[PDB]
Amino acid sequence: SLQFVFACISYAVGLGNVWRFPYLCQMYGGGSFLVPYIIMLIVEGMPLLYLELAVGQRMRQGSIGAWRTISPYLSGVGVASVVVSFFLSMYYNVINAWAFWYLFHSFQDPLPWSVCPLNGNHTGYDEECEKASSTQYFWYRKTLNISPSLQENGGVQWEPALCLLLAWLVVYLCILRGTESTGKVVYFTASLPYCVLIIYLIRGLTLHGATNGLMYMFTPKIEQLANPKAWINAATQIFFSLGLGFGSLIAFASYNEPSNNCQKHAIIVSLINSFTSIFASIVTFSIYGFKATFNYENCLKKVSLLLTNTFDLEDGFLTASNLEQVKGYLASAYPSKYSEMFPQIKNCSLESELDTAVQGTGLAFIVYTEAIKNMEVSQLWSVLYFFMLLMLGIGSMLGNTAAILTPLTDSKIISSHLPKEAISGLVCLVNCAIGMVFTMEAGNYWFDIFNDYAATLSLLLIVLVETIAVCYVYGLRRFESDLKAMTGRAVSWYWKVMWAGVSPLLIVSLFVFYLSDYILTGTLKYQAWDASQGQLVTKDYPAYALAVIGLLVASSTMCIPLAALGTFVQRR
Amino acid sequence: FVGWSTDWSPYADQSIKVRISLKSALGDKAYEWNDNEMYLFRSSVAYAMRQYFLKVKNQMILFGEEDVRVANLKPRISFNFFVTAPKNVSDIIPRTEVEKAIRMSRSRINDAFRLNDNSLEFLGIQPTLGPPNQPPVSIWLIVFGVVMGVIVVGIVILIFTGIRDR
Numbered sequence: 001s002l003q004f005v006f007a008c009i010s011y012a013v014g015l016g017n018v019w020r021f022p023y024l025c026q027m028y029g030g031g032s033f034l035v036p037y038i039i040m041l042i043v044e045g046m047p048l049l050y051l052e053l054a055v056g057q058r059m060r061q062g063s064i065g066a067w068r069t070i071s072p073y074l075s076g077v078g079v080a081s082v083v084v085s086f087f088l089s090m091y092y093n094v095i096n097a098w099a100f101w102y103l104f105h106s107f108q109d110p111l112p113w114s115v116c117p118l119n120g121n122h123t124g125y126d127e128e129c130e131k132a133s134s135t136q137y138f139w140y141r142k143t144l145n146i147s148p149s150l151q152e153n154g155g156v157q158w159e160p161a162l163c164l165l166l167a168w169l170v171v172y173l174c175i176l177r178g179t180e181s182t183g184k185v186v187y188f189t190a191s192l193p194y195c196v197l198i199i200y201l202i203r204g205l206t207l208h209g210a211t212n213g214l215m216y217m218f219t220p221k222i223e224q225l226a227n228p229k230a231w232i233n234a235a236t237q238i239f240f241s242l243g244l245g246f247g248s249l250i251a252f253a254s255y256n257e258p259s260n261n262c263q264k265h266a267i268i269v270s271l272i273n274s275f276t277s278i279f280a281s282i283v284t285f286s287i288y289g290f291k292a293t294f295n296y297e298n299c300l301k302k303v304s305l306l307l308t309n310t311f312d313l314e315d316g317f318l319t320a321s322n323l324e325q326v327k328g329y330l331a332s333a334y335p336s337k338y339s340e341m342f343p344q345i346k347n348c349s350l351e352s353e354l355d356t357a358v359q360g361t362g363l364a365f366i367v368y369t370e371a372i373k374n375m376e377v378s379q380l381w382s383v384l385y386f387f388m389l390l391m392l393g394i395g396s397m398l399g400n401t402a403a404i405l406t407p408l409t410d411s412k413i414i415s416s417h418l419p420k421e422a423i424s425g426l427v428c429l430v431n432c433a434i435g436m437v438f439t440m441e442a443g444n445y446w447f448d449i450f451n452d453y454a455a456t457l458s459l460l461l462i463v464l465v466e467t468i469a470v471c472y473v474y475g476l477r478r479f480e481s482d483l484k485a486m487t488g489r490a491v492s493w494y495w496k497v498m499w500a501g502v503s504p505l506l507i508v509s510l511f512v513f514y515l516s517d518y519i520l521t522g523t524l525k526y527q528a529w530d531a532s533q534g535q536l537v538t539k540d541y542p543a544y545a546l547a548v549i550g551l552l553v554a555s556s557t558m559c560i561p562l563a564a565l566g567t568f569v570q571r572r
Numbered sequence: 573f574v575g576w577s578t579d580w581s582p583y584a585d586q587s588i589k590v591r592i593s594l595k596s597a598l599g600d601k602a603y604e605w606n607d608n609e610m611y612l613f614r615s616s617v618a619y620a621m622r623q624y625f626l627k628v629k630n631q632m633i634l635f636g637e638e639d640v641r642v643a644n645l646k647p648r649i650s651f652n653f654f655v656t657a658p659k660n661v662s663d664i665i666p667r668t669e670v671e672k673a674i675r676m677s678r679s680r681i682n683d684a685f686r687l688n689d690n691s692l693e694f695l696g697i698q699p700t701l702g703p704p705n706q707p708p709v710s711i712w713l714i715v716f717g718v719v720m721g722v723i724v725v726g727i728v729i730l731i732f733t734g735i736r737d738r
C-alpha cells in the first residue's frame with residue numbers, strides 16, 4: 001500500500017501545487033478562487049480519481065488497452081490521453097529551466113534580484129527597475145527579456161535555450177538511470193518540499209503585513225465569485241494537479257492487486273494534494289501580502305515626502321495617521337499652491353496593491369526571490385528552495401514522460417527497430433527542439449498560451465468521455481458487480497451517484513458557461529509586460545495566436561471522434 | 573514692468589539651498605536644530621571652503637563662520653547659504669566653486685551631523701553611489717558548465733554501459 005500511495009503522491013505533487021496554484025489563486029481573486037476549488041474537489045476530484053483507479057484495477061491493462069477493451073469505437077480516447085501529455089511535456093520543462101536559471105544566479109553575494117542596476121549617471125537607479133521591483137525587473141528583463149507584445153518577437157535567447165537543454169538532459173539522464181530505485185527517494189523526496197515550505201512559512205508569517213496577504217487569500221469576494229472563468233480554472237487545475245486525463249494513473253493502478261481498497265487510497269491522495277496546494281499557497285500569499293503592504297507604505301511615504309518638501313512642513317510632522325486631515329488643512333490654508341500638484345498627489349490603498357502587486361506565471365519566482373532577499377544567508381535558502389522546486393519538477397516530468405513513452409515502448413513495430421534508449425533519446429530531442437519557441441523574446445506569451453490551453457479543457461473532455469464510457473456504455477451495474485467481486489465490498493452509493501450523474505453534469509455546465517462567456521465577450525485577452533509603466537496591461541490576442549489556441553485543444557479532443565469514424569469505416 | 577516681486581534678492585543667484593531631515597535619518601535620539609547647530613554647520617562649510625581653496629587653487633584664504641551667510645531659515649530646516657570673501661562683503665564666491673568645494677568635502681559635513689547624503693541635500697549637488705563591481709566573467713555560466721558537463725558524462729557512461737551489457 002505504501003509503495004502505490006507514495007508513487008501516486010510523488011506523481012500528483014509537483015509544480016502544479018507549488019507554482020500554478022498560487023498564481024491561479026491570485027489571478028481570480030484569492031478567496032473567490034478558493035471556494036470553488038474545494039467545491040470542485042468534492043464533486044470532481046475524488047469521484048473521478050477513484051473511477052480512474054478502479055478502471056485501472058478492473059481492466060488491469062494500460063490506458064489504450066483498457067479503453068479499447070471496453071469498446072473498439074472508443075480506443076481513440078487512449079491515444080488522445082497520450083497527446084495531451086506530449087503537449088504538457090512540451091512546455092512543463094521550461095519551468096524547470098527557469099528554476100535552473102534561478103539556481104545558477106544564487107552563488108553571488110550581490111544577488112541579481114536584490115539590488116537594481118545603476119541608471120547611468122551612477123547617481124540613481126534604472127527607471128524600469130525603480131517603477132517595478134528588483135525581483136520583477138530580474139524576472140521580466142534579466143530572465144525572459146519579455147517583449148512588450150506578442151506580435152514583437154526576436155531571436156532565440158541563448159541563455160534560456162541552454163537552461164532548457166540542461167533540464168532536458170537531466171530528464172533524459174533520470175530516465176536512463178533509474179526506474180525502481182525510488183525506495184529511499186520516496187523517503188526523502190516527499191519530506192524535503194514540506195521542510196522547505198515549513199521554513200518559508202516560519203519566515204513568511206513574521207514579516208510585516210503578512211495577515212493582509214492571508215486576509216486577501218481567505219476572503220471570498222462575492223462580486224468576483226460569479227466569474228465562470230474562476231470555476232473553469234479551478235476545475236482544470238484540480239484535473240491537472242491530480243493528473244486526471246493523462247492516462248498514467250490507470251497504468252499505475254494496473255499494477256496493483258484487485259483485493260485492495262481504492263476508496264481509501266483515492267481519498268488520501270486527493271486530500272494530500274489539496275493540503276499541499278493550500279499550504280504552499282498560504283506561504284506564497286503571506287509573502288505576497290508582505291509585498292503589498294511594503295508597496296502601500298512606500299507610496300504613503302512618497303506622498304508624505306512630496307507634501308513636506310513643498311509645504312515646508314517639519315520632518316516627522318506628516319505621518320500616515322494624519323495625512324488626510326493635514327491635506328485638508330493644507331488645502332484650506334491656500335488653494336493656489338495646492339492646485340499645482342493636485343494631479344501629482346497619488347491615491348494608494350491596500351486593496352488595489354493587493355490585486356496588482358504581482359501577477360502572472362512568475363508569481364512564485366518573484367515572491368520567493370523577494371523572500372530570499374529578506375533572509376540572513378540568502379544564498380543557502382535560495383539554493384534549498386530552488387532545489388526543492390527542481391526535485392518536484394523533475395519527478396513530475398519523469399511521471400509525464402513515462403506516460404508518454406510506455407505506449408511507444410509497448411509498440412512492437414518501433415521496439416523491433418530501435419532500442420528504448422534511442423526511442424527515449426529521440427522523444428527528448430523532439431520535445432527540447434520544439435520547446436525552443438518558449439525561449440524567444442515573446443516566448444512567455446506562448447508559454448502562457450500553452451499553460452492555459454494545451455492541457456486545460458482537453459482534460460475535461462477526456463474525463464467526461466471516460467466517465468460516460470464507464471457508466472453508460474460498459475454498464476454501471478456490471479462494473480459495480482465486477483468491483484465487488486474483485487474486492488468483496490460493493491461501491492458505495494455516493495460514489496455511484498457522483499460517477500453517473502453529478503460529475504458529468506457539472507463538467508457540461510462548466511463547458512457551457514465558459515463557451516457562453518467567451519461568445520458574449522468576443523475578445524480574448526492576455527497580459528503583457530509594460531516596462532515604461534512597469535506593470536501588466538491587457539492586450540487582445542492576434543489572429544495567428546487564436547489558430548494555435550484552437551488547434552492545441554482541438555487536436556487532442558477531436559482525436560476521439562476521428563477514431564470512432566475510422567472504426568465505423570473499417571466495419572463498413 | 574511696473575511693480576515688484578517680493579522674491580528676487582541680489583544674493584539669490586549664488587545661494588545654495590540646504591534641506592536637512594533629522595527625524596528621518598535618526599528616528600529617535602535626534603537632537604534639536606538650535607542656533608548652536610547652525611554655528612556648527614557654518615563652521616563646517618567654512619572649513620570645506622578652506623580645504624577647497626588650499627588643495628585645489630593653492631591659495632590660503634581665511635574663511636570664517638561669519639562668512640557663510642544664511643537666509644530663509646524654516647522649520648523643515650531648509651535654508652539658503654552663500655559664502656563671501658574673507659573680509660570683502662561685495663565679493664561673493666561664485667556658486668560653481670562653492671558646489672565643487674561641497675562635493676570635495678561632503679563626507680566630513682555628513683559625518684559632523686550623522687547624516688548620509690539623503691537627509692542632508694544640497695539641491696544641486698547629486699551624489700554618486702559608486703560603480704557596482706562585476707565578477708571576472710560569470711559565476712552562473714561556470715556553474716552551468718560544470719553541471720552540464722557532469723550530466724553529459726553521466727548520460728554517455730550510462731548509454732555506453734547499457735549498450736555494452738546487451
Ligand SMILES: *[C@@H]1O[C@H](CO)[C@@H](O[C@@H]2O[C@H](CO)[C@@H](O[C@@H]3O[C@H](CO)[C@@H](O)[C@H](O)[C@@H]3O)[C@H](O)[C@H]2NC(C)=O)[C@H](O)[C@H]1NC(C)=O
Pocket residue numbers: 657660662663664
Ligand atoms: C572685493 O571684491 C570685488 C569683486 O566682487 C572687487 O571689485 C573688483 O575690483 C577690481 C579692481 O578695481 C576691478 O577691476 C577693475 O575694473 C575696472 C572697471 O572698468 C577697471 O577700470 C580696472 O582697470 C580694473 O579692471 C573689478 O572690476 C571689480 N569687480 C567687481 C565685480 O566690481 C573689490 O576690489 C574687492 N575689494 C577689495 C578691497 O579687494
Ligand SMILES: *[C@@H]1O[C@H](CO)[C@@H](O)[C@H](O)[C@H]1NC(C)=O
Pocket residue numbers: 119121698
Ligand atoms: C541623470 O540622468 C538623467 C537621464 O535619465 C538626466 O536627465 C539627468 O540630467 C542626469 N543627472 C545629472 C546630474 O546629470
Ligand SMILES: *[C@@H]1O[C@H](CO)[C@@H](O)[C@H](O)[C@H]1NC(C)=O
Pocket residue numbers: 342343344345346347
Ligand atoms: C486621486 O483621487 C482624487 C480624488 O478622489 C482624484 O481626483 C484623482 O484623479 C485621483 N488620482 C490621482 C492621480 O490624483
Ligand SMILES: *[C@H]1O[C@H](CO)[C@@H](O)[C@H](O)[C@H]1NC(C)=O
Pocket residue numbers: 122699700701702703
Ligand atoms: C561617485 O563618483 C564620484 C566621481 O564621479 C566619486 O568621487 C564618489 O566617491 C563616488 N561615490 C562612491 C564611490 O561611493
Ligand SMILES: O=C(O)[C@@H]1CCCCN1
Pocket residue numbers: 011012013014015016017240241242243246396400
Ligand atoms: O503536480 C504537478 O505538477 C503534476 C503535473 C502533471 C500531472 C501530475 N501533477
